[PDB]
Design a protein around this ligand. Structure first.
Ligand SMILES: *[C@@H]1O[C@H](CO)[C@@H](O[C@@H]2O[C@H](CO)[C@@H](O[C@@H]3O[C@H](CO[C@H]4O[C@H](CO)[C@@H](O)[C@H](O)[C@@H]4O[C@@H]4O[C@H](CO)[C@@H](O)[C@H](O)[C@H]4NC(C)=O)[C@@H](O)[C@H](O[C@H]4O[C@H](CO)[C@@H](O[C@@H]5O[C@H](CO)[C@@H](O)[C@H](O)[C@H]5NC(C)=O)[C@H](O)[C@@H]4O[C@@H]4O[C@H](CO)[C@@H](O)[C@H](O)[C@H]4NC(C)=O)[C@@H]3O)[C@H](O)[C@H]2NC(C)=O)[C@H](O)[C@H]1NC(C)=O
Ligand SMILES: *[C@@H]1O[C@H](CO)[C@@H](O[C@@H]2O[C@H](CO)[C@@H](O[C@@H]3O[C@H](CO[C@H]4O[C@H](CO)[C@@H](O)[C@H](O)[C@@H]4O[C@@H]4O[C@H](CO)[C@@H](O)[C@H](O)[C@H]4NC(C)=O)[C@@H](O)[C@H](O[C@H]4O[C@H](CO)[C@@H](O[C@@H]5O[C@H](CO)[C@@H](O)[C@H](O)[C@H]5NC(C)=O)[C@H](O)[C@@H]4O[C@@H]4O[C@H](CO)[C@@H](O)[C@H](O)[C@H]4NC(C)=O)[C@@H]3O)[C@H](O)[C@H]2NC(C)=O)[C@H](O)[C@H]1NC(C)=O
Ligand SMILES: Nc1nc2c(ncn2[C@@H]2O[C@H](COP(=O)(O)OP(=O)(O)O)[C@@H](O)[C@H]2O)c(=O)[nH]1
Ligand SMILES: Nc1nc2c(ncn2[C@@H]2O[C@H](COP(=O)(O)OP(=O)(O)O)[C@@H](O)[C@H]2O)c(=O)[nH]1
Ligand SMILES: [Cl-]
Ligand SMILES: [Cl-]
Ligand SMILES: [Cl-]
Ligand SMILES: [Cl-]
Ligand SMILES: [Cl-]
Ligand SMILES: [Cl-]
Ligand SMILES: [Cl-]
Ligand SMILES: [Cl-]
Ligand SMILES: [Cl-]
Ligand SMILES: [Cl-]
Ligand SMILES: [Cl-]
Ligand SMILES: [Cl-]
Ligand SMILES: [Cl-]
Lengths: 466, 466
């Protein structure tokens, strides 16, 4: 038993004890206040609580690294990623391409870059589940009509040709067992749905994944994102060079302010301050554990006016941004190679930051977060997102299990019993989530701490030949 | 690296994260309320916060046990105490008692039983440090003119006689190096002071103790209490008998309400309710982890009126008490053998409880708390005390170290910089403590979480011969 482990655990315990003593002390005081004195005092309370909370959180972090837990998790995360990448590659490069089973995916989904990247990921996962080599057709890709190889390495070295002795539009893994080439539709109209979808992870990796990663769902998705966006030689140079021209050095917090056409239709408008509170709050967290010389925010946005506004409102922050990329993402010029390379770099630097603040309603941010999973052992927690929790457009039902019972205080809350299964609609980031208790078919709010994430598994192939 | 360990660590992180989301949300709501509506809501807040916090504490308890941490901690705590007991016994039992170095301690200090026991502990500790066998003179003991052996086995089987070729009153370990038998005075007039006092622990055990125990000072003191209170056969039988007759079964929470003469001069009067909140809060905690069939409180008091009052106010709690022991402790009849038997038994059952609630200003509670240390691996946190932090009457300076800087918000607070040394006067159990910042010599309040306990060591002998 390790001595730092025990000292840390004991300080995390006592930190909560003093936080609770303090909570009681100051709430009893607040009950007897009014007006300006109540607001002054409640605001000071929150300041003090913030620093308290950040000290507990910092101690928990150290606990996560002590006793070589840091070394081990990294080692084990590396071995897992190498294994899945070895299996994906093995699958993607059959010896005999004319005689290989194939899954044909077409990149031209009527949406944006991240929505399309995710369509190729969803295709890729099903190809991995069905043991079919992925044939990505990318001619006339609206962003770069040259095709996928304009920016990224092709998904296969040996098998890029979609030909075979029998081809058919998908109809089930059972029905298609002897169709050589299967054309796969977008998840929005897939029928029947195979088991090889998010957020389920492979049965065979699941135990190892839970030991290491806080959200094995995102980790599994990220494995295909990683392989896909393997970059062309010139793109690797463009990214490396742009890293130099921009002042991009860690410690940096990545921020994605998505506006333009998303507002109103798929997500809300959020002011810059709504993002920057988490940025400052999480620089404060970082500063408790390392030296923070200047507070750098990498700012990815499609509002070109934002950069000037942000710099004036936050004069202590160095803002790293490529405002001309921001202009390139405006709609009049959005679907062009110049813009595509723009969003690929913005997403890159987002994924590379130490922490991410954004809206998970955007496919752009979600990909940044997915790519982030591949650059650390467990980067599952590295975001204070503003609206949706994580999801994979097309996933199966996202379920939780209640672990503590809850009795509804108002009519807007649902009751929970331990074991009850709750499908979550979202987290409100106020201590409550919204969801349906499937047992009683009632929808409402429940205290977010009272549920446990239900990890789902699938019997995927294990490709032992790699 | 362990899987239950990692799931647990992440839920403590996530549970604390949701607690902060909740704290921010509901405090912002409170800022805009008035009077009765503010009070309704603030009280509901506190109710919810309690259960949130108790869930975090429960996961922290479980983390304390996973990966066999529990099993190992017990074994190591067992090995330590067996070693210290083997060393004390060796010292107390020379082969030639006529030629042994001896330290003469006199039990009849002008105070009560616990204060006298603690005087004998201080003598024992100094005798251990100087390698002198403890000769405990106890005739005319105010509690039992029969002597120490009225209740307890003698502190030595071979060496109980105080004779030697040179005897003298203490004058320092260096000056007395060749006086065979040294008479030790009460700590109140010990001069010079030797290094062998609380709250310092032996140099060689300090690393092993910190791996195991949350308050190594108490663990070291309890080691001597343990050796001291080995009871005579009738008393051992009396304890077993009273255990059956009172119906003492775990889960039981010990409560010690000290009143009579202690009020006004040495401590405050506290209503039964001030104790019973911590009792319920902690049965609520226990109930989160085990079955609580009946809520048992063991009640030690010198107020014989309390038992009837308590039973009436708390009709859900089974009160295990010996009201006549409460009567035997009354002022007019306190210093007799039957009374001494009362307090010894009251202290026994207190130490035996799953948790202790009391005033540490009373030596009676402190002795129970010290004895409690020898019945569990780390039982240092098993109290929600009502005034003083733990201390040993006569001790050296109790120092903490500031670990996070603090700037004083009002005039009652002291400033701290990390590394600053804080002499602690006590904890207010409201999130603040009182103390002196020695570097700048200022006295005041500081947030209790911003300090770290300063463990002090002393080079004690190691008695290789056992
Ligand atoms: C055409 O273009 C687009 C690309 O731009 C292509 O991409 C698709 O675009 C949409 C929009 O982004 C994506 O839909 C989103 O899905 C989110 C995930 O939903 C699934 O999982 C959820 C939890 O993680 C769970 O809540 C859902 O039940 C759902 O899970 C489904 O479950 C089934 C089993 O039960 C499975 O079999 C299904 O497969 C599975 N479904 C999916 C999608 O896989 C979802 O959370 C998100 O909803 C939020 O945002 C909605 C706005 O789009 C909002 O709608 C508003 O609702 C309110 C009241 O309900 C109403 O007053 C208002 O007027 C509505 N606004 C509009 C315009 O509809 C939702 O209510 C919901 O709100 C969120 O609520 C939570 C909790 O309160 C908050 O924490 C949060 O703040 C809040 N979010 C926001 C920002 O408002 C949304 O539906 C889709 O995933 C994506 N698809 C793909 C495949 O990538 C599209 O594919 C292109 N089409 C074609 C033909 O190619
Ligand atoms: C006669 O019989 C008695 C048996 O009872 C024998 O035993 C002695 O009994 C007394 C009282 O029962 C014990 O006194 C207590 O000492 C506690 C420890 O003091 C040491 O450690 C402190 C930090 O923990 C440190 O700050 C102290 O100065 C001291 O540390 C010293 O350090 C020195 C180096 O600088 C060393 O060289 C010394 O060796 C070492 N000294 C000692 C004493 O060991 C102490 O915590 C405790 O103080 C609290 O309780 C007081 C009441 O007893 C309370 O008094 C009030 O003071 C305010 C202003 O200060 C005054 O206006 C008011 O009138 C007083 N009110 C009352 C109720 O009387 C103190 O304020 C203090 O308050 C505590 O404050 C914190 C935070 O503010 C709260 O969390 C807490 O609730 C609160 N406590 C209470 C109960 O209110 C007390 O002084 C004594 O230790 C013990 N000595 C021994 C050696 O056994 C005695 O031996 C017999 N004598 C003879 C002739 O045989
Ligand atoms: N370079 C850049 N482009 C963006 C940004 N936000 C949106 N875009 C552009 O808008 C498209 C958004 O489409 P999509 O990937 O489907 O994400 P979503 O509409 O926000 O859910 C991206 O592919 C980019 O062309 C940004 O922050 N930086
Ligand atoms: N049996 C019994 N005796 C008590 C109790 N509380 C106080 N006394 C008596 O009062 C004495 C108080 O002396 P002491 O040990 O110095 O404790 P203190 O005065 O509270 O610090 C005890 O030793 C007992 O004689 C109690 O709960 N049970
Ligand atoms: Cl092959
Ligand atoms: Cl299928
Ligand atoms: Cl760097
Ligand atoms: Cl600023
Ligand atoms: Cl499960
Ligand atoms: Cl399956
Ligand atoms: Cl395990
Ligand atoms: Cl040992
Ligand atoms: Cl000897
Ligand atoms: Cl007397
Ligand atoms: Cl000395
Ligand atoms: Cl006997
Ligand atoms: Cl029992």
């Amino acid at each position: 038993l390790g001595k730092d482990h025990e000292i840390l655990r004991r300080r995390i315990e006592n930190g909560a004890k003093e936080l609770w003593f303090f909570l009681q002390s100051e709430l009893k005081k607040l009950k007897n206040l009014e007006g300006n004195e109540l607001q002054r005092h409640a605001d000071e309370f929150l300041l003090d609580l913030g620093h308290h909370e950040r000290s507990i959180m910092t101690d928990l972090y150290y606990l996560s690294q002590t006793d070589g837990a840091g070394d081990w998790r990294e080692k084990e995360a590396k071995d897992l990623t190498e294994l899945v990448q070895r299996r994906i590659t093995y699958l993607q490069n059959p010896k005999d391409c004319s005689k290989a089973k194939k899954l044909v995916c077409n990149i031209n989904k009527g949406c944006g870059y991240g929505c399309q990247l995710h369509h190729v990921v969803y295709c890729f996962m099903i190809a991995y589940g069905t043991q079919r080599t992925l044939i990505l057709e990318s001619q006339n890709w609206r962003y770069a009509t040259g095709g996928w190889e304009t920016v990224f390495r092709p998904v296969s070295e040996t098998c890029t040709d979609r030909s075979g002795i029998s081809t058919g539009h998908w109809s089930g893994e059972v029905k298609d067992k002897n169709v050589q080439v299967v054309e796969l539709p977008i998840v929005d109209s897939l029928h029947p749905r195979p088991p090889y979808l998010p957020l389920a992870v492979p049965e065979d990796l699941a135990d190892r994944l839970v030991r290491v990663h806080g959200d094995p769902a995102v980790w599994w998705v990220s494995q295909f994102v990683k392989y896909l966006i393997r970059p062309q030689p010139w793109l690797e140079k463009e990214i490396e060079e742009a890293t130099k021209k921009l002042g991009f050095k860690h410690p940096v917090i990545g921020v994605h302010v998505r506006r333009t056409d998303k507002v109103g239709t798929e997500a809300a408008f959020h002011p810059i301050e709504e993002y920057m509170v988490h940025v400052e709050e999480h620089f404060q967290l970082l500063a408790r554990r390392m030296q923070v010389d200047k507070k750098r925010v990498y700012l990815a946005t499609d509002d070109p006016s934002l950069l000037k506004e942000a710099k004036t409102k936050y004069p202590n922050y160095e803002f790293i941004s490529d405002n001309s990329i921001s202009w390139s993402a405006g709609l009049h010029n959005r679907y062009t190679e110049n813009s595509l390379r723009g969003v690929i770099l913005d997403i890159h630097f987002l994924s590379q930051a130490d922490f991410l603040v954004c809206t998970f309603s955007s496919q752009v941010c979600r990909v940044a977060y997915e790519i982030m999973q591949t650059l650390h052992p467990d980067a599952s927690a590295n975001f204070h997102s503003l609206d949706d929790i994580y999801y994979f457009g097309g996933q199966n039902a996202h379920n939780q299990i209640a672990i503590y019972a809850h009795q509804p205080r108002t009519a807007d809350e649902i009751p929970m019993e331990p074991g009850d299964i709750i499908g979550v609609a979202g987290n409100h980031w106020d201590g409550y989530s919204k969801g349906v208790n499937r047992k009683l078919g009632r929808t409402g709010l429940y205290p977010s701490y009272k549920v446990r994430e239900k990890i789902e598994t699938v019997k995927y192939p294990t490709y032992p030949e790699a």
